Each structure stands twice: as C-alpha cells, then as structure tokens.
C-alpha cells in the first residue's frame, strides 16, 4: 500500500 | 492539473501540550497514494516522522513511535503530537508517496513553536 | 533502520563550476535504484529533483545528474547558476518501512 500513482 | 497539499494547526503550544496537524489534499485519492510526514528544525535537516500507507497502516521514525499518531479521512491526513518538547519546534510538511518511493509532492509547512 | 550520510557538509563554487554531492546508504536501496534528490530553499518546500538515482523530475534542468546504485550515490550540478544556490538532501527507500534523509549539504554559488 506504499507508493502512488506518480514517480 | 491541480494537484496540491497544504498543512495547517501549527501554532505556538506549552510543553505537554497536544496538538494535532492536518494535511489538506487536492487532485489525487488516499486510497491509490501513501503519504508522509516531515519536519524541519530551524537551521536542521529535513527529517522523516512517518508515512501512512493507503490501508492506512502507519509506520514512524524510531523516535517518534509512540508519540506521534497519523490517521485519515478521504481528503485530509493528520499528525497527533504528544508530549512535546522545545525540540519537537520545527516546520512541519506533509508529502505525498510516489512508486519509485520517494516524495513527488510537498506542501508549504506549518510551523510549530513549542515554548514557555 | 538505515541511515544516510551525506557529504560534504557544505562547499562553494563559482557560476558555471561543476557541483558533486555524495549520498552513502547503510544498506543497498530498493531494487538497487530507490534513491532521491531533492533541492531546498530557505522557507521553502524541499524540490525533488531526482528519483530512481538517475531520472529527471519534471521541470529540472539536465545541468542535474544523478548517478550510482547499491549503497553509494552522486548528484553533479554542471555549470551552476545562482539559482542553485540552496541545500541538496538524499533519501533511500528500503525492503523495510523507513524512509531516511541525508544530513544536507548547503551549495554556495560564488557570483
């Protein structure tokens, strides 16, 4: 659940 | 676009006393992006609190396990400081996650003064 | 948990010098490349610059180069401009749930 939909 | 973050609650507090910071966010979910909270002492490093994953499982600093408690809405995060000291006196940022795991999005600060 | 040193703590060139910034993690980064750049100006938000070690973020200039893997990373600025004047930070990401920050360097252009 880490991160996101951009770099 | 219009994607965007800003911080808010920072203030002058005793020590001891709680405070709670928000983090507004535009133009993206919580349920596809993690987030962070930072903090900067004045004339210090930037340092990482914690993060709080889109499950909403939270994961802090060493040292601010315990004191520091992170939650979410569907627009806003927050940061539960307790048990404040003159060294908790820092501008406060949250962030917002990116895939390669690293910061792609800062709001502005909050600054809080914790002082007698 | 792993740590990030950083150096040096500071240095000066002068307008269009040459700028390089070392990054040492504790431990290999995430996939051997999950390591950041970002740029900080006094009563700012911190700018990332770079992410993956080596790709460029939007609306950086290609003066900004980032290199290395594993544990030992660089950030060259070629040909500084006053603009560049600021404090640079590094962070790691990790198999683990921590997401640390060099102590910073503060880069001083001589004009």
């Known amino acids: 659940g880490k991160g996101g939909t951009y770099p | 676009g219009d994607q965007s973050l800003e911080e808010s609650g920072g203030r002058l507090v005793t020590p001891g006393t709680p405070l709670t910071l928000t983090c507004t966010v535009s133009?993206?979910?919580?349920?596809?992006?993690?987030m962070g909270w930072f903090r900067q002492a004045p004339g210090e490093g930037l340092e990482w609190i914690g993060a709080?994953?889109?499950?909403?499982s939270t994961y802090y600093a060493s040292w601010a396990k315990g004191r520091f408690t992170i939650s979410k809405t569907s627009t806003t995060i927050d940061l539960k400081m307790t048990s404040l000291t003159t060294e908790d006196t820092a501008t406060y940022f949250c962030?917002?996650?990116?895939?390669?795991?690293?910061?792609?999005?800062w709001g502005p600060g909050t600054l809080v003064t914790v002082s007698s | 948990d792993p740590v990030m040193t950083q150096t040096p703590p500071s240095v000066s060139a002068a307008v269009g010098g040459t700028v390089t910034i070392s990054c040492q993690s504790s431990?290999?980064?995430?996939?051997?490349?999950?390591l950041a750049w970002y740029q900080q100006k006094p009563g700012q938000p911190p700018k990332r610059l770079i992410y993956?070690?080596?790709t460029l973020d939007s609306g950086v200039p290609s003066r900004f180069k980032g290199s290395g893997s594993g544990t030992q990373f660089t950030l060259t600025i070629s040909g500084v401009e006053c603009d560049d004047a600021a404090t640079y930070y590094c962070?790691?990401?990790?198999?683990?749930?921590?997401?640390?920050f060099g102590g910073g360097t503060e880069v001083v252009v001589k004009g």
């Open positions: 133009g993206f979910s919580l349920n596809n992006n993690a």
């Open positions: 431990q290999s980064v995430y996939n051997n490349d999950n």
């Open positions: 962030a917002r996650h990116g895939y390669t795991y690293s910061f792609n999005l």
């Open positions: 962070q790691g990401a990790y198999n683990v749930d921590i997401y640390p």
């Open positions: 993956g070690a080596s």
């Open positions: 709080i994953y889109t499950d909403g």
